[PDB]
Write a protein that binds this ligand. Structure first.
Ligand SMILES: Nc1ncnc2c1ncn2[C@@H]1O[C@H](COP(=O)(O)OP(=O)(O)OP(=O)(O)O)[C@@H](O)[C@H]1O
Ligand SMILES: Nc1ncnc2c1ncn2[C@@H]1O[C@H](COP(=O)(O)OP(=O)(O)O)[C@@H](O)[C@H]1O
Lengths: 412, 434
């Protein structure tokens, strides 16, 4: 039976939890598309004690017009396909986050910040995100990095130079990232235009067509439960669906999702039987052709990037296949990935598949551990004055960050 | 399961390590003095030194002559060729009588060869030829255990082209033979069209590449026959093969000469080894005087196998002479070239043991009171007749809902199926009616 989600927690703090040693403790801000995750670096403690503000990245303002609201509670959100592209709907998302974390007082946030961004970020987008940050909030110095690569940095066996493929899958994108000597080989990195949002959207539209008698009973927040709790990824889809074909297996494995009641009441207050549907929603990232979409999918793409290298460095970078982010949470994901990988390697060769320690939070914990180390490496950060000579389309090439290129944007 | 048959209970000569016989062992009973002699023959065949030496088993019907001859083939085992033939096989309509003798003498000598069987199989990922004309062709293969690349010669490429292979097909290559087999299209492409005439198979779940050590057996006769007439060369695909029907033919002496000379080359190089085997000319008294005379030449030849003969005749006329009698139906001239082993009639207690060994081979339970009755009936008739009644008796026991032969079952069957002796008594009485 379905549950309902929680809302409106009580995060309130003093003006700044400044510890011993250096006073400018940075904010660690994972600016996610599904949800934002934000908090103080809190140095000198091994386990990250409190990743506060776990909240959905969505805002309310309706037919009333005169007000808007920002916490977990018609709706809007600041992103287009995992790049932020909104003005004040970004501000009132930052404002919520700062106010609930506490801030000093004066006409700026006194603390430096580390902020996640898109695997590639359009130059205009980076420029705007820098302007909307330095101008309005007055931050002293800033760092941009990629969610996935922070999660890798967290999960590495050692704080040392590495190579691998990162497999990442968030709200509206999945990416395959080849990395060599700690550097993202962004020349031949690739992404797929699908993700967990689109899975839920498909599972919704399926069950709407299965039970037209009660369109209103099924809605995204209930699709979330069946997709998180009750769905799994096949080892081989055309074989799973084949064992699902016989009634004696079906009845033993179909999921009985009881709606809340007011004929045994199921003619409207149905038990929403999900069978094959609990496979067809996860599978979208491996076979986007279950939707209309003609793209290679996470299987053909991995082969298509992996055959663009010399045969020795393939055998190097496949030694660390890493799973992180959103959709990798499905049960069975490691097994499907390592089976699909076994067919596309030399007959006796070796590979290894690692799953992130906490697939959803390790991006933030990574950004924490990174900033807490690189406090004083002033070649890594963008300082407030640099933004006055370099127009905002500028970045500092540390590991776990997008590849910079010399370029400039006309503005007046 | 395997069908039970007339000798399937005998498993060897069953001699002890000193060479002496045991009373009852390896599915034989009795006959110590006569089957210790086969022990010596087995050592002679295992010694490999000799050629053309020969043996005659002699004695009345039903005394074990072919059982002992098959027991020898067990003690040698499948390493060594053992060619059985019946005297009456000589009278072909395609070739002269001595040619049939000579073919069968060659069949009893084997080449034993070793090679590493090596197999590649899976979906074809790519074909790429490699200047002016094709020097080699690269091919890629995939299975659910991995991928490989291979480097083919243009002869193999011609064979792939002939099989109508293209990328996405599932293929078996055998690297030794140059054998190539198409097995259908890989089912990943099964949606290329809704209806198309191909057959689609799943991607193989086995290894891309496999190795074995195998042993090839071939006789000198196989070399003779393959090399004498032009090999047809038709994997079908060639209508000229339709016109000229095959026939057997007199293989020339010259060709056997060259074959001997080439095989000697390979057993010097260590590529092959030689196994002199056995030819069992059973029913020998059915040979003609021409053939009996030709054996005086072939048994002298310093290449010939060991030959075993068997016969059941007394002092009958030699076939083709119209006149001359001789022991065992064999000419005295040849009978002085063989060592003779005599074979002896069974006492009643021997037959009881044979009957019980047949019963438990054939799968039938029999009570002691019934087995004593088949023992008695065997003394009145013959061993080969008492052993026939076991199965029909069991089948009546089964119809009457019982597991085991009891006296009234064998007694009923005895009244229902006659013997040759008692049927002949009927023919002597109703003499004028047949
Ligand atoms: N000593 C024995 N031990 C076990 N079974 C035997 C023995 N002697 C003969 N037999 C069996 O009895 C039958 C005897 O066939 P046998 O070898 O006597 O044929 P034969 O008359 O000598 O020659 P042919 O094969 O030409 O008829 C077979 O079923 C055989 O297996
Ligand atoms: N436990 C879970 N099982 C399955 N899917 C999950 C789970 N938790 C989150 N998701 C999926 O994760 C996606 C969001 O992941 P996230 O890393 O926050 O995205 P981003 O970094 O792009 O904002 C959502 O589409 C959601 O459906």
């Amino acid at each position: 039976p379905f549950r309902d989600a929680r809302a409106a927690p009580d995060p309130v703090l003093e003006a700044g939890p400044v510890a011993h040693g250096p006073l400018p403790v940075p904010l660690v801000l994972d600016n996610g598309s599904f949800q934002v995750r934000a908090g103080w670096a809190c140095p000198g403690q091994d386990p990250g004690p409190e990743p506060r503000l776990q909240f959905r990245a969505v805002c309310a303002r309706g037919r009333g017009g005169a007000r808007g609201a920002s916490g977990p509670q018609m709706l809007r959100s600041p992103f287009d396909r995992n790049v932020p592209v909104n003005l004040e709907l970004q501000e009132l998302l930052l404002d919520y986050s700062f106010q609930h974390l506490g801030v000093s007082s004066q006409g700026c946030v006194d603390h430096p910040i580390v902020l996640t961004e898109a695997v590639c970020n359009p130059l205009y987008s980076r420029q705007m995100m820098s302007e909307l940050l330095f101008e309005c909030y007055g931050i002293p110095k800033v760092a941009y990095g990629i969610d996935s690569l922070f999660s890798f940095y967290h999960n590495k066996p050692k704080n040392s130079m590495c190579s691998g493929l990162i497999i990442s899958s968030g709200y509206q994108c999945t990416h395959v990232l080849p990395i060599l000597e700690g550097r993202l080989d962004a020349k031949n990195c690739k992404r797929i235009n699908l993700g967990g949002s689109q899975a839920a959207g498909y599972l919704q539209r399926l069950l709407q067509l299965k039970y037209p008698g009660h369109l209103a009973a099924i809605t995204l927040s209930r699709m979330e439960e069946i997709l998180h709790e009750h769905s799994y990824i096949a080892e081989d889809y055309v074989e799973e669906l084949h064992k699902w074909r016989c009634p004696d297996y079906y009845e033993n494995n179909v999921h009985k999702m009881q709606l809340p009641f007011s004929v045994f009441n199921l003619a409207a207050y149905h038990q929403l039987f999900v069978g094959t549907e609990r496979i067809r929603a996860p599978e979208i990232i491996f076979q986007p052709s279950l939707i209309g979409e003609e793209q290679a999918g996470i299987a053909e793409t991995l082969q298509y990037i992996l055959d663009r290298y010399p045969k020795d460095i393939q055998e190097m970078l496949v030694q660390n296949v890493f799973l992180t982010g959103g959709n990798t949470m499905y049960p069975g994901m490691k097994a499907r990935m390592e089976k699909e990988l076994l067919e596309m390697r030399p007959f006796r060769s070796s590979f290894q598949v690692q799953l992130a320690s906490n697939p959803v939070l390790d991006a933030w914990y990574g950004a924490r551990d990174w900033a807490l180390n690189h406090l004083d490496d002033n070649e890594v950060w963008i300082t407030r004055k640099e933004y006055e000579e370099k127009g905002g389309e500028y970045l500092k090439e540390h590991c776990a960050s997008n590849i910079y290129v010399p370029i400039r944007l006309p503005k007046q | 399961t395997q069908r039970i048959a007339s000798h399937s209970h005998v498993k060897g000569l069953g001699l002890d390590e000193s060479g002496l016989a045991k009373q009852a062992a390896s599915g034989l009973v009795g006959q110590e003095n006569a089957r210790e002699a086969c022990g010596v023959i087995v050592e002679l065949i295992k010694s490999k030194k000799m050629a053309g030496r020969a043996v005659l088993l002699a004695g009345p019907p039903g005394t074990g002559k072919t059982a002992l001859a098959l027991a020898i083939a067990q003690e040698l085992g499948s390493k060594v060729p053992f060619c059985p033939m019946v005297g009456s096989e000589v009278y072909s309509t395609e070739i002269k009588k001595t040619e049939v003798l000579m073919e069968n003498f060659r069949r009893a000598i084997g080449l034993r060869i070793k090679e590493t069987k090596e197999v590649y199989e899976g979906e074809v990922t790519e074909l790429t030829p490699c200047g002016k004309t094709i020097s080699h062709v690269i091919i890629g293969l995939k299975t659910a255990k991995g991928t490989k690349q291979l480097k083919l010669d243009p002869s193999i490429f011609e064979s792939l082209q002939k099989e109508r292979v293209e990328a996405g097909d599932v293929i078996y290559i055998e690297a030794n033979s140059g054998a190539v087999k198409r097995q259908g299209r890989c089912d990943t492409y099964a949606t290329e069209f809704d209806l198309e005439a191909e057959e689609y198979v799943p991607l193989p779940k086995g290894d891309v590449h496999k190795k074995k050590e195998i042993i090839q057996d071939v006789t000198l006769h196989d070399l003779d026959v393959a090399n004498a007439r032009p090999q047809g060369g038709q994997d079908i695909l060639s209508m000229m093969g339709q016109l000229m029907k095959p026939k057997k033919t007199e293989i020339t002496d010259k060709l056997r000469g060259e074959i001997n000379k080439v095989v000697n080359k390979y057993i010097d190089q260590g590529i092959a080894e030689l196994v002199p085997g056995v030819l069992f000319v059973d029913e020998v008294h059915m040979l003609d005087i021409e053939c009996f005379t030709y054996l005086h030449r072939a048994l002298e030849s310093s290449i010939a196998p060991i030959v075993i003969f068997a016969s059941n005749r007394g002092n009958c006329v030699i076939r083709g002479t119209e006149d001359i009698t001789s022991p065992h139906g064999i000419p005295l001239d040849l009978l002085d070239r063989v060592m003779i082993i005599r074979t002896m009639l069974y006492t009643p207690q021997e037959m009881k043991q044979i009957i019980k060994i047949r019963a438990q081979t054939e799968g039938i339970n029999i009570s002691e009171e019934a087995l004593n009755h088949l023992g008695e009936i065997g003394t009145k008739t013959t061993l080969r007749y008492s052993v026939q009644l076991l199965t029909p008796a069991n089948l009546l026991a089964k119809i009457n809902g019982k597991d085991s032969i009891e006296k009234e079952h064998v007694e009923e069957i005895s009244e229902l199926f006659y013997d040759a002796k008692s049927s002949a008594k009927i023919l002597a009485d109703q003499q004028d009616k047949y």
